[PDB]
Amino acid sequence: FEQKIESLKKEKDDQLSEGNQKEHFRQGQAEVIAYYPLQGEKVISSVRELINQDVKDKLESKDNLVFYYTEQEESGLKGVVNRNVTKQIYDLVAFKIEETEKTSLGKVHLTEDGQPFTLDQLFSDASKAKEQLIKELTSFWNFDYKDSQIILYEIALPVSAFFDVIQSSYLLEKDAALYQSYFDKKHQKVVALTFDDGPNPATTPQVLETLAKYDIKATFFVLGKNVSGNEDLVKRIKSEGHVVGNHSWSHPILSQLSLDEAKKQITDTEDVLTKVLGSSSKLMRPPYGAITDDIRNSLDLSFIMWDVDSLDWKSKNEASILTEIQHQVANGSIVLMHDIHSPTVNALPRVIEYLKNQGYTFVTIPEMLNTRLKAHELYYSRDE
Ligand SMILES: [Zn+2]
Ligand SMILES: [Zn+2]
Ligand SMILES: [Zn+2]
Numbered sequence: 001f002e003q004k005i006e007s008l009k010k011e012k013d014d015q016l017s018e019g020n021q022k023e024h025f026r027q028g029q030a031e032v033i034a035y036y037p038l039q040g041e042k043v044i045s046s047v048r049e050l051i052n053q054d055v056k057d058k059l060e061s062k063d064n065l066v067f068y069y070t071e072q073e074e075s076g077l078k079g080v081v082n083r084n085v086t087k088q089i090y091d092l093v094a095f096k097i098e099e100t101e102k103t104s105l106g107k108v109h110l111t112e113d114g115q116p117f118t119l120d121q122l123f124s125d126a127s128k129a130k131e132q133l134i135k136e137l138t139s140f141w142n143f144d145y146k147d148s149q150i151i152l153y154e155i156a157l158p159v160s161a162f163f164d165v166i167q168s169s170y171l172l173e174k175d176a177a178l179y180q181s182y183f184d185k186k187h188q189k190v191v192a193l194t195f196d197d198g199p200n201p202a203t204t205p206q207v208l209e210t211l212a213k214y215d216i217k218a219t220f221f222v223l224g225k226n227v228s229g230n231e232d233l234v235k236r237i238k239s240e241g242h243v244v245g246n247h248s249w250s251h252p253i254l255s256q257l258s259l260d261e262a263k264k265q266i267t268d269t270e271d272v273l274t275k276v277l278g279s280s281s282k283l284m285r286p287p288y289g290a291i292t293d294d295i296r297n298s299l300d301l302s303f304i305m306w307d308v309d310s311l312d313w314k315s316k317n318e319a320s321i322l323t324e325i326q327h328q329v330a331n332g333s334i335v336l337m338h339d340i341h342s343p344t345v346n347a348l349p350r351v352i353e354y355l356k357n358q359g360y361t362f363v364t365i366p367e368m369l370n371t372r373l374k375a376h377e378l379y380y381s382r383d384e
Contacts, residue, residue, distance in 0.1 A: 001092065004092065004097060005065060005092060008065060008090060008097075009033070012033065012035075012067055012069070016035045016069050017035075019037060019038055020035035020036060020037055020038060020069065020070075021035070021036045021038060021043050022034070022035050022036075023035075023036065027055065027059065027061070028061070029061070029062055029063045029064075030059070030060075030061030030062070030063070030064050030065075030066055031064075031065050031066070032055065032059075032061075032066045032067075032068070033065070033066070033067050033068075034048075034051050034055075034067070034068040034069070035067075035068065035069040035070070036048045036051070036070075037070050037072070037083060039110075039113065039114030040113075040114070042114075044083060044108075044110065044114045045114075046108045046110070046115075046116045047070055047083045047085065047108055050085055050106045050108055051068045051085060054068070054087060054105060054106070055068075061089065063091075063092070063093050064089050064090060064091055064092070065089075065090040065092060066087065066088070066089050066090070067086075067087070067088045067089075067090075068085065068086070068087050068088075068105075069085075069086055069088075070083045070084060070085050070086065071083070071084050071086070072084075075109055075117075075145055076145040076146055076147075076172065077109075077117075077122070077145055077170045077171070077172070078169065078170050078171060078172050079111065079112055079170070080109055080110065080111060080112075080117045080170065081109075081110050081112065082107055082108065082109055082110070083107065083108050083110060084103070084104050084107050085104070085105045085106045085107060085108075086101055086102065086103050086104070086105060087101065087102050087105040088100070088101035088102075089101070107142075107144070109143075119141050119143050121167070122166060122167060122170055123162070123165045123166055123167060124165055124166070124167050125165050128164075128165045129162055129165045129166070132161060132162050132164075132165070133150075133152075133157070133162070136157045136158075136161050136162075137152070137155065137157070140155050140157065145159075148160070148174065148175055148178060150162070159171075159175060159178070160178060160182065163179060163182045163183075166179075168183075186331065186332075186383065187331055188331060188332070188361075189331050189358075189359050189360045189361060190331065190332060190360065190361050190362075190363045190367075190368060190382065191329055191331075191332075191333045191334075191335060191355060191360045191361075191362060191363070192218075192219060192333070192334045192335065192362070192363050192364065192365050192367075192368045192382075193211075193216070193218040193219075193335050193337060193351075193362060194218065194219045194220070194221060194245075194285070194304075194306065194334060194335060194336060194337065194365065195207065195218060195219070195220045195221070195337050195338060195339035195344075196220075196221045196247055196285065196336065196337070196338050196339075197221075197222075197223055197226075197247060197251070197338050197339075197340045198220060198222050198223070198226060198338075198339045198340050199220070199222055199226055199227075199230045199233045199234055199237065199339075200226070200339065200340040201230055201233060203339055203340055203341065203342060203344075203345050204220075204233060204237070204339050204340075205233070205236075206345045207339040207344070207345055207348060208236065208237065208240055208242075210345070210348045210349060210352070211240070211242070211348075212240060213349075214349070214352045214353075214356070216352060216362035217240075217241050217242050217243070217362065217363070217364050218242050218243075218362070218364065219242065219243040219244075219245055219281075219283070219304075219364050219365040220237050220242055220243070220244050220245065220339065221245040221246065221247035221283070221284075221285040221304070222234065222237075222244060222245070222246070222247055222269075222273075223247050223248065223249065223250065223251055223269070224246075224248065224249035224250070224265075224268055224269030224272050224273075225249050225250045225251075227269075227272045227273070227276060228272075231276050234273070234276050234277065235276060235277065238277050242364065243281050243283065243364040243365055243366055244273060244277060244281060245281055245283035245284060245285055245304065245365065246266060246269045246270060246273065246280070246283065246284040246285070246301070247269070247284075247285050247287065248265045248266060248269060248284075248286070248287050249265045249266075249268050249269050250265065251287040252265060252287065253287065253288055253290045254266075254286050254287065254290055254291055254292075254295060255286075255290040255291055255292045255295070256290070259292075259294050259295065259298065262292075262295050263295060263298050263299060266284055266295070266299060266301070267299070270301075281365075281366060282300065282301045282302060282373075282375075283301065283302055283304050283365055283366070284299070284301045284302070284303050284304065285303070285304045285305070285306075286303060286305075289305050289306075291303055291378070296376045296377070296378065297376050299375070299376070300375040300376075301375060301376075302369070302373045302374065302375065302376075302377055302379060303376075303377065303378045303379065304334065304365055304379050305334070305378060305379060305380045306333075306334040306335065306336040306380060306381075307328075307330070307332075307333050307334055307380045307381040307384060308324075308325070308328040308329055308330075308333045308334065308335045308336060309324070309328075309336045310324050310325055310335055310336055310337045310344075310351075311324050312337050312338055312341070312343060312344045312347070313338050313341075315343075316341060316343045317343060318343055318346045318347035318350070319347075321337075321343065321344065321347040321351065322347055322350050322351055322354065325351050325354065325355070326354055329355065329360070330381075331382070332368070332381045332382025332383050333381055333382075334365070334368070334379070334380065334381050334382075368382050369382065
């Protein structure tokens with residue numbers, strides 16, 4: 001019995017003496033031996049703390065011999081390494097030596113100099129990161145990092161989903177390439193002009209002439225009620241290469257109607273657009289941006305909001321319209337305008353010129369969202 005215990009102790013020293021500091025103590029009836037890793041000439045504090053925590057709370061051991069030790073592993077993040085902690089318990093009261101180990105009892109992320117690396121350091125702003133985590137979390141802090149995914153305690157979350165607030169400097173070659181793709185797309189200078197509440201026979205034709213003059217396309221979210229009597233004009237919008245979307249039949253606050261009456265405001269418009277145009281873009285913009293999860297979840301359409309309100313409907317002033325666009329438009333913006341009043345008709349040329357002068361490419365909503373478009377989903381911009 002004594003010789004067998006001596007053999008286990010010799011084996012562990014042969015295996016782990018180098019690069020570790022060995023602590024030995026009796027805790028009740030249990031005999032504990034812990035090998036703490038050294039970073040340089042000093043014990044990695046957070047690893048010892050993790051082990052001490054186990055000793056205090058779990059541990060428990062009646063008559064046993066308990067070993068703790070670690071191994072360094074890459075973390076999958078640049079300049080960060082992991083210390084995996086193993087705990088092994090030997091039962092010697094038995095005729096035969098029994099043992100059980102937990103290979104990854106715990107784990108600590110560390111900087112190359114042995115200091116703690118916490119999940120908040122992976123971001124340029126923890127507050128927001130926490131927020132996005134919460135989301136992708138809810139839909140689907142001790143963590144791991146593997147194959148381009150963040151793993152919490154397990155739930156594997158793509159690292160991609162937090163690129164907006166991540167400290168990309170921590171990404172290795174592969175993830176750095178993925179980030180480059182994200183960055184390049186994020187910085188593509190595209191904008192989608194959108195026009196609501198039409199068609200209006202007295203203003204829409206002028207808007208179409210102006211878009212044609214400037215060689216750009218737009219997306220028109222039309223009211224079902226305005227289609228009757230203006231069928232040729234709606235066909236004209238589509239023949240000029242613009243995308244026609246659904247703005248409800250008569251512009252009520254959809255969230256204040258019963259579910260089926262709201263759905264029908266939408267489907268009646270899909271029906272008349274399909275009858276006149278032969279097809280639907282399956283894009284729907286709620287009047288006033290008012291919508292509910294139930295409505296969205298009830299229809300196979302993508303709901304298109306906006307991130308830039310030109311306020312043309314409020315200001316009714318060309319100079320104001322241009323100023324709002326100049327200050328608000330961003331990469332991937334969806335601009336809300338109305339092709340039913342003259343101020344917008346008049347301001348359109350200077351708005352287009354300004355944006356072209358700043359290097360923007362004008363795109364339709366389908367061009368902007370292309371692969372991101374899914375039924376039931378809400379979209380405020382290319383990325384939000
Ligand atoms: Zn074992
Ligand atoms: Zn409207
Ligand atoms: Zn569905």
